[PDB]
């Protein structure tokens, strides 16, 4: 809380930058694939487990943000 020196001041920002930025990347990645994905479900409920698994890898960005937001606070 309160005043902070230059490290704390720099990190305080970046806790926010981190949370906003990851979300943005995740969304864009999701938009192209997500648009593509749906017809297959209609056809195949059977493959749906495969589909459920299919979307996942870019989404990783958000989780990194919570650990780092946690880490920053305390050098803050």
């Amino acid at each position: 809380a309160a005043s902070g020196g230059l490290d704390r001041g720099l990190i305080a920002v970046g806790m926010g930058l981190a949370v906003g930025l990851a979300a943005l990347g995740t969304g864009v990645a999701q938009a192209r694939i997500g648009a593509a994905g749906v017809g297959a479900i209609a056809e195949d409920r059977s493959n749906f487990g495969t589909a459920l698994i299919f979307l996942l890898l870019p989404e990783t960005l958000v989780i990194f943000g919570l650990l780092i937001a946690f880490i920053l606070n305390g050098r803050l």
Binding site: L67, F70, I71, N73, G74, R75
Partner: protein, 632 residues
Amino acid sequence: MIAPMEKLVLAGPKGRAKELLQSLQQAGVVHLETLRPEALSAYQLSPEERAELRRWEAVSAGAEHTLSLLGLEAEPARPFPEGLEAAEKALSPIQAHAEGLTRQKQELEEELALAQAYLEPLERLAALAHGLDKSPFLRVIPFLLTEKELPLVEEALRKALEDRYLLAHEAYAGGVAALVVVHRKEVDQAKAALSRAGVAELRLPGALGELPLSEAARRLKERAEAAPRELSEVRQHLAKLARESASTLQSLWTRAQDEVARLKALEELASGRFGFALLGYVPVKAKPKVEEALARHKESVVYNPPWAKPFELLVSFLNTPKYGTFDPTPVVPVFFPFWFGMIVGDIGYALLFYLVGRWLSGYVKRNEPLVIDLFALKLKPQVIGKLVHILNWMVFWTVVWGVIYGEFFGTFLEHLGVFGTPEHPGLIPILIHRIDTAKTANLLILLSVAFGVVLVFFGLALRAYLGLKHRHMAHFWEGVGYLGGLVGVLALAASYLGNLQAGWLQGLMYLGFGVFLLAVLMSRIWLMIPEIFTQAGHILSHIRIYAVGAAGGILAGLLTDVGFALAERLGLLGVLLGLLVAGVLHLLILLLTTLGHMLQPIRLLWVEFFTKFGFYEENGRPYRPFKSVREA
């Protein structure tokens, strides 16, 4: 059925054409080629022979097909004889049983399905109807409508009929089974009125429906009831047939099959002798002697471990000749150190990879589809699973070796071997990393960097052997000449490579070294010399792949460190169990991703493989891709 002998089929490369040819010919084996352009034009099989083959196909197929409907199988083995007649005969009764029952079972299911479904509407309509399709004086039109329909159907009916009809309904659920009753002569208008509304006279389609609503209703109780029981029997017989006869089905099947291929083999050789492979018909007397040896190049149908197992498979690709330089075979021992060494982990990385290895080499039934791992049971391709049972052991050894690369790596953290840092800590060994801090870290940076360079050197040595010994002069000229540049490269490099440790054991050495480079590129002329630029690009890539294989590697160990050890705030103690909230979680995620890292060894390798450093592929080019070669 040909003249006596068992047909033998082989195909292979040009070298094996010869080795193979000699091996069949001397004993008293017959109708051998390539040994003349087509004296098998004077071994053209008869139409009769083609026919026998044809029969074998009906039988072969019949067994497969019948096995399918029956719901069981058989799989291809090594050929054997029975006589066609015996097999056909064998195939026939069973095919007839299984087939009849399979249909019956299907029918039974349908009987049950419809009858139960229909049971309720026919009953509702019947209860209302008190018999009227019995009568001709009154005619009744049953129809089902939802109450969504009811005011509209009613208006259409009303408009045609007035009050000269009876509209009654008793519900079926979500609608009402309805009757429009009309007098004789009113029938035509009555159907049309429902149709306009969009409803229409409803009963079951076909013969059953026509029966009184009351009668149909009775039948529905009976069919629904009867059918599962009846189904049990038909299914039982079928199951029973599959169970008993499966071996048999297969034996006929195998027998037949061996003929279908065998006969075909004869026909083609008959016809037009093929080429680099080798045919023949080999007697009963001749038959083993030729087969035992094989020299490792063809494909037939008759009638410590860490270093050897995948390495054994590269041996087969050594033997083929079709060009003038050494065959592509080094890859498996190039792979191995890094394969084991990708895992160079710490507490949660390398040292936990074990759990998996004993599961896979062993059998794990823990899994929803994996049971005994020897049996390749999977929601993904089963077939694919069986072959790499061999691999489960070699992977288990990898898992064991990666664990070892945890303590040598861990030298430059903890342990003893080149450093002195505690042989073992007390709390969490690898609490944080020596390597995260720069000096230790730096040594690892420089460490990958060299390794990409090393794979390049091996390639250009091979390149010069290739163009030399294949007499691809343009390529020869290229492999030696390109090496001319290098001394100058080392010159420039040094002032940044040790920074202060070097830079001045060489200098403007480049100015004469660059000339040495280009001399013979220019001797062939080569109207496309600039193109050497791309040969230089690979070097940077080789480096990058190793670097990443390391860095992503290092990252893996460090997630156990921010996942179990130290991170939060400036880095504190209780983070150990604050992170344990996370701690169980990081482990599995980590596992999934490191699999991604090992495709990088191969990515590196792929750089080298199609870069004409002792290779036949060059974006195709007669020979099977390398893709298929290395996998097990």
